[PDB]
Amino acid sequence: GVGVSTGTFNNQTEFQYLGEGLVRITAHASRLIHLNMPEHETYKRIHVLNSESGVAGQMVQDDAHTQMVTPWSLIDANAWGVWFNPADWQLISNNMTEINLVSFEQEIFNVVLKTITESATSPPTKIYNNDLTASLMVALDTNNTLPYTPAAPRSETLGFYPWLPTKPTQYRYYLSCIRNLNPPTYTGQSQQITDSIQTGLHSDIMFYTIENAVPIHLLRTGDEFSTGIYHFDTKPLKLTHSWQTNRSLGLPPKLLTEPTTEGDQHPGTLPAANTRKGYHQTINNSYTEATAIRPAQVGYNTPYMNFEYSNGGPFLTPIVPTADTQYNDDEPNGAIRFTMDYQHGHLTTSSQELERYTFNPQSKCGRAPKQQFNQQAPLNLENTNNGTLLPSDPIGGKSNMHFMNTLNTYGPLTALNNTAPVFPNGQIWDKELDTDLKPRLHVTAPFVCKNNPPGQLFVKIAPNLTDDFNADSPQQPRIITYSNFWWKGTLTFTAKMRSSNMWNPIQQHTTTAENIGNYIPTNIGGIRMFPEYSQLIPRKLY
Amino acid sequence: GVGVSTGTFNNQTEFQYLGEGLVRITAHASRLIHLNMPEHETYKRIHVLNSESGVAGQMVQDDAHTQMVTPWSLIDANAWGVWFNPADWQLISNNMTEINLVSFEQEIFNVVLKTITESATSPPTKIYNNDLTASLMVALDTNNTLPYTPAAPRSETLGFYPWLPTKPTQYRYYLSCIRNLNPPTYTGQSQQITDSIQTGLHSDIMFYTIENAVPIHLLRTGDEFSTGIYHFDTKPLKLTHSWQTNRSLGLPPKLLTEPTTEGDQHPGTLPAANTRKGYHQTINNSYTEATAIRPAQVGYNTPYMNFEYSNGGPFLTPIVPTADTQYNDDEPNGAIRFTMDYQHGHLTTSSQELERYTFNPQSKCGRAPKQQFNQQAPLNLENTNNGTLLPSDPIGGKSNMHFMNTLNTYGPLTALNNTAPVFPNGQIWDKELDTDLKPRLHVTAPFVCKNNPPGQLFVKIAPNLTDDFNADSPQQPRIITYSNFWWKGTLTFTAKMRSSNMWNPIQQHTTTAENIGNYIPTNIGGIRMFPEYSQLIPRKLY
Amino acid sequence: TPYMNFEYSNGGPFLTPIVPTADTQYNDDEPNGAIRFTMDYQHGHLTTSSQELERYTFNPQSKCGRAPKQQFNQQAPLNLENTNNGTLLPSDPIGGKSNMHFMNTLNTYGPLTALNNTAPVFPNGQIWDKELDTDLKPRLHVTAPFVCKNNPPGQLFVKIAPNLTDDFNADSPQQPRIITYSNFWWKGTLTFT
Amino acid sequence: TEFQYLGEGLVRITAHASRLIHLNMPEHETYKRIHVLNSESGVAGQMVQDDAHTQMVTPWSLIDANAWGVWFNPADWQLISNNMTEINLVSFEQEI
Amino acid sequence: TLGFYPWLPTKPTQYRYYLSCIRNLNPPTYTGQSQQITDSIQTGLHSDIMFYTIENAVPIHLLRTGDEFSTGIYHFDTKPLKLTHSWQTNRSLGLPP
Amino acid sequence: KLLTEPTTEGDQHPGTLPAANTRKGYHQTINNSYTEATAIRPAQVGYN
Identify the three-state secondary structure at position A65. Answer: strand
Terminal C-alpha separation, chain E: 52
Cα(B412)–Cα(B415) distance, integer angstroms:
8
* Domain count across chain B: 1
User: Smallest CA–CA separation between C80 and chain E, in Å?
Assistant: 18
Q: What's the Rg (C-alpha) of chain E?
A: 26
**CB atoms A290 and D28 under 8 Å:** no
CA-closest candidate to residue A357, choices A328, A341, A343, A336: A336
User: Smallest CA–CA separation between C146 and chain D, in Å?
Assistant: 8
Of C44, C117, C148, Cβ closest to residue E76: C148
- Best mutation target among A414, A436, A539, A541 (most C Cβ atoms within 10 Å) is A414
Residues at the binding site of B are: 143
Chain F residues inside the 8 Å CB shell of B44: 5
β-sheet bridge partners, residue A257? A269
Burial classification of residue B265, based on how many CB atoms lie within 10 Å of its CB (0-12 exposed, 13-18 middle, 19 or more buried): exposed
Q: Which amino acid is at C159?
A: K
Is the CA virtual torsion C167, C170, C171, C177 positive or negative?
A: positive
CB pairs under 8 A between A and E: 81
Residue of B nearest to E50 (CA): B520
Cα(B448)–Cα(B101) distance, integer angstroms:
10
**Residue B89 parent element (H or E):** helix B86-95
Is the Cβ of D57 closer than 8 Å to some Cβ of chain A?
A: yes
- Best mutation target among A247, A326, A375 (most E Cβ atoms within 10 Å) is A326
Cα(C134)–Cα(C115) distance, integer angstroms:
22
Q: Do the Cβ atoms of A253 and A270 come closer than 8 Å?
A: yes
Residues at the binding site of B for Mg(2+) are: 143
* Resolution of this entry, Å: 3.5
**Interchain touch D–E (≥3 Cβ pairs closer than 8 Å):** yes
**Residue B117 parent element (H or E):** strand B113-119
Q: Do the Cβ atoms of A535 and A323 come closer than 8 Å?
A: no
Cα(B111)–Cα(B132) distance, integer angstroms:
10
Is the Cβ of B309 closer than 8 Å to some Cβ of chain D?
A: no
DSSP state of B408: -
Question: What DSSP line would sit under B191-226, residue for residue?
Answer: -----B-----GGG-----HHHHS-EEEE-TT--EE
CA-closest candidate to residue C26, choices B412, A377, B141, D6: A377
CB contact set of B386 (below 8 Å; sequence gap of 6+): none
Is the Cβ of A401 closer than 8 Å to some Cβ of chain C?
A: no
Is the Cβ of F43 closer than 8 Å to some Cβ of chain B?
A: yes
Is the Cβ of D25 closer than 8 Å to some Cβ of chain E?
A: no
CA-closest candidate to residue B220, choices B108, B111, B138, B109: B111
Question: What DSSP line would sit under A403-419, residue for residue?
Answer: GGGT-----TTEEB---
Q: Do the Cβ atoms of A267 and C113 come closer than 8 Å?
A: no
Dihedrals φ, ψ of B45, to 5°?
-110, 95
Is the Cβ of A251 closer than 8 Å to some Cβ of chain E?
A: yes
Residue of A nearest to E14 (CA): A254
User: Smallest CA–CA separation between C61 and chain B, in Å?
Assistant: 46
Residues at the binding site of A for Mg(2+) are: 143
User: Do strands A429-430 and A447-448 pair parallel, antiparallel, or not at all (unpaired)?
Assistant: parallel
Method: X-ray
Burial classification of residue A478, based on how many CB atoms lie within 10 Å of its CB (0-12 exposed, 13-18 middle, 19 or more buried): middle
Query: Which A-chain residues 263-302 have CB contacts (< 8 A) with chain B?
Result: 263-264, 266-268
Q: Read off the CATH number of the domain in which B314 is found.
A: 2.170.30.10
Cα(B14)–Cα(E78) distance, integer angstroms:
31
The domain of B159 spans: 1-542
Chain B residues inside the 8 Å CB shell of A85: 500, 503
Chain C residues inside the 8 Å CB shell of B346: none
Question: What DSSP line would sit under E33-75, residue for residue?
Answer: -------B-----GGG-----HHHHS-B----TT---B---EE
Is the Cβ of F4 closer than 8 Å to some Cβ of chain B?
A: no
Residue of E nearest to B164 (CA): E55
Chain C residues inside the 8 Å CB shell of D16: 187-189
β-sheet bridge partners, residue B308? B315
Cα(B73)–Cα(C168) distance, integer angstroms:
14
- Best mutation target among C166, C168, C174 (most B Cβ atoms within 10 Å) is C166
Q: Do the Cβ atoms of A395 and A374 come closer than 8 Å?
A: no
